[PDB]
Write an enzyme that holds these catalytic residues in place. Sequence first.
Site, PDB file in Angstrom:
ATOM      1  CG  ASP A  57     -58.336  63.313  76.455  1.00  0.00           C
ATOM      2  OD1 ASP A  57     -57.502  62.395  76.600  1.00  0.00           O
ATOM      3  OD2 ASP A  57     -58.619  64.128  77.357  1.00  0.00           O
ATOM      4  CG  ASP A 138     -33.298  63.383  68.573  1.00  0.00           C
ATOM      5  OD1 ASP A 138     -34.105  63.502  69.520  1.00  0.00           O
ATOM      6  OD2 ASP A 138     -32.317  62.614  68.605  1.00  0.00           O
ATOM      7  CG  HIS A 142     -34.429  60.007  61.907  1.00  0.00           C
ATOM      8  ND1 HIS A 142     -33.159  59.879  61.389  1.00  0.00           N
ATOM      9  CD2 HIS A 142     -35.041  58.817  61.694  1.00  0.00           C
ATOM     10  CE1 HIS A 142     -33.014  58.673  60.870  1.00  0.00           C
ATOM     11  NE2 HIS A 142     -34.143  58.009  61.040  1.00  0.00           N
ATOM     12  CD  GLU A 143     -37.850  56.737  61.327  1.00  0.00           C
ATOM     13  OE1 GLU A 143     -38.311  56.638  60.171  1.00  0.00           O
ATOM     14  OE2 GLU A 143     -36.927  56.009  61.754  1.00  0.00           O
ATOM     15  CG  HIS A 146     -37.004  58.370  56.906  1.00  0.00           C
ATOM     16  ND1 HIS A 146     -36.033  57.718  56.178  1.00  0.00           N
ATOM     17  CD2 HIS A 146     -36.520  58.482  58.166  1.00  0.00           C
ATOM     18  CE1 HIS A 146     -35.010  57.439  56.966  1.00  0.00           C
ATOM     19  NE2 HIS A 146     -35.280  57.892  58.178  1.00  0.00           N
ATOM     20  CE1 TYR A 157     -34.588  54.159  54.952  1.00  0.00           C
ATOM     21  CE2 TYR A 157     -33.892  51.959  55.592  1.00  0.00           C
ATOM     22  CZ  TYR A 157     -34.212  53.254  55.927  1.00  0.00           C
ATOM     23  OH  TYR A 157     -34.157  53.645  57.245  1.00  0.00           O
ATOM     24  CD  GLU A 166     -31.701  55.627  58.589  1.00  0.00           C
ATOM     25  OE1 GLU A 166     -31.428  55.453  59.778  1.00  0.00           O
ATOM     26  OE2 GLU A 166     -32.817  55.996  58.212  1.00  0.00           O
ATOM     27  CD  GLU A 177     -32.251  67.137  69.882  1.00  0.00           C
ATOM     28  OE1 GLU A 177     -31.078  67.010  70.281  1.00  0.00           O
ATOM     29  OE2 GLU A 177     -33.076  66.206  69.918  1.00  0.00           O
ATOM     30  CD  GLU A 187     -24.000  63.045  70.837  1.00  0.00           C
ATOM     31  OE1 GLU A 187     -23.719  61.876  70.502  1.00  0.00           O
ATOM     32  OE2 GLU A 187     -23.259  64.021  70.597  1.00  0.00           O
ATOM     33  CE1 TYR A 193     -30.382  52.717  72.614  1.00  0.00           C
ATOM     34  CE2 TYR A 193     -28.518  53.805  73.645  1.00  0.00           C
ATOM     35  CZ  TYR A 193     -29.057  52.716  72.992  1.00  0.00           C
ATOM     36  OH  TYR A 193     -28.273  51.621  72.717  1.00  0.00           O
ATOM     37  CB  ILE A 197     -27.346  54.145  80.642  1.00  0.00           C
ATOM     38  CG1 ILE A 197     -27.434  52.663  81.010  1.00  0.00           C
ATOM     39  CG2 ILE A 197     -25.897  54.574  80.502  1.00  0.00           C
ATOM     40  CD1 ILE A 197     -27.016  51.730  79.893  1.00  0.00           C
ATOM     41  CG  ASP A 200     -26.656  55.980  77.000  1.00  0.00           C
ATOM     42  OD1 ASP A 200     -27.367  56.804  77.615  1.00  0.00           O
ATOM     43  OD2 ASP A 200     -26.924  54.762  76.935  1.00  0.00           O
ATOM     44  CG  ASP A 226     -28.804  48.357  58.764  1.00  0.00           C
ATOM     45  OD1 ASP A 226     -30.017  48.448  58.474  1.00  0.00           O
ATOM     46  OD2 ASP A 226     -28.152  49.292  59.271  1.00  0.00           O
ATOM     47  CG  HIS A 231     -30.114  52.061  60.191  1.00  0.00           C
ATOM     48  ND1 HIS A 231     -30.650  51.235  59.228  1.00  0.00           N
ATOM     49  CD2 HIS A 231     -31.152  52.757  60.710  1.00  0.00           C
ATOM     50  CE1 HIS A 231     -31.955  51.430  59.160  1.00  0.00           C
ATOM     51  NE2 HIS A 231     -32.286  52.349  60.049  1.00  0.00           N
TER      52      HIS A 231
HETATM   53 CA   LIG Z   1     -30.608  64.531  69.780  1.00  0.00          CA
HETATM   54 CA   LIG Z   2     -31.319  66.928  74.610  1.00  0.00          CA
HETATM   55 CA   LIG Z   3     -29.821  57.355  78.176  1.00  0.00          CA
HETATM   56 CA   LIG Z   4     -57.974  62.952  79.741  1.00  0.00          CA
HETATM   57 ZN   LIG Z   5     -34.323  56.439  59.512  1.00  0.00          ZN
END
Ligand SMILES: [Ca+2]
Ligand SMILES: [Ca+2]
Ligand SMILES: [Ca+2]
Ligand SMILES: [Ca+2]
Ligand SMILES: [Zn+2]
Length: 316
Positions: A57, A138, A142-143, A146, A157, A166, A177, A187, A193, A197, A200, A226, A231
């Site tokens: 930057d 999250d 989460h990852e 791992h 896995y 998982e 979080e 969630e 996501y 919507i 969810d 899977d 998962h």
């Molecule tokens: Ca969450």
């Molecule tokens: Ca939230």
């Molecule tokens: Ca959403």
């Molecule tokens: Ca910049």
């Molecule tokens: Zn995962």
Amino acid sequence: ITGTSTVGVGRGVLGDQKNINTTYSTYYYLQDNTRGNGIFTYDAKYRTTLPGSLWADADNQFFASYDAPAVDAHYYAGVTYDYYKNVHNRLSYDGNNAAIRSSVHYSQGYNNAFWNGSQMVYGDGDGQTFIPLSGGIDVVAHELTHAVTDYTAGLIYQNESGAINEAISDIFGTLVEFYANKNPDWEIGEDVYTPGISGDSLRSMSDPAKYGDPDHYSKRYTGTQDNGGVHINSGIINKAAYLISQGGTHYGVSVVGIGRDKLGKIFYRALTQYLTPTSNFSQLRAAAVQSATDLYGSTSQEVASVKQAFDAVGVK
Ligand SMILES: [Ca+2]
Ligand SMILES: [Ca+2]
Ligand SMILES: [Ca+2]
Ligand SMILES: [Ca+2]
Ligand SMILES: [Zn+2]
């Protein structure tokens, strides 16, 4: 880069103002020297080759639309590091302050984020199924778990062992979080996501069968898709671990929640002291029962709630 440590100001995926640790050497690089051996965020530049170029930057201000995922990947990386260091006294994922590297703008329209055995990878999402996946805290934590699981339990896995992996990443993704107190909930990935919507999420630890994930061991997935449904059967352990923290009744089985902190204590100890590469759900129950006994005593309520919540999901 060998250069001057500094703080930069930028905008996240969801438009929130932030301050990011950067390192100055001709350019401002998204490199954090404050934590461990360094936190590094790379620009994959819409390509598969990793890690790409360390984010540069010219003016140490990261308010460009293109910078929005990089800031979140670099900033939430420092948050998950802070959680493991402050809540569990673990320096990075290997316990030895290992460098944390993330690559943003991965591929084109990639609707996933993953730890590929060495570093963090974040696609930008297609704008409909996902927005840049580093936006959800999250998702990052989460990852990042791992990475933690790779150096401790090493759960393979596939099958139940992968489903525990998982679920472990889901629990500690939610617990981080909650650590940031960034509009926390049980969630998974509601931040990035389906932007059209609302209300969810990708998964639900409180209600796994709300999106068709089994909330009971009888309801688990026993096919071969899977990688055995790692998962999919994460919803059983998610439902177990969430009853541990919160309580309630699941299929007529009451559980007295012991709070997030005690659950986060129980699973981490079980993760790093008792769980093995090929652990199954029952062995996880023995490990969680064994870990609560060390921390709280066999005659304590925390052991009791762990026994009750596993009975509720049918894990014996
Ligand atoms: Ca969450
Ligand atoms: Ca939230
Ligand atoms: Ca959403
Ligand atoms: Ca910049
Ligand atoms: Zn995962």
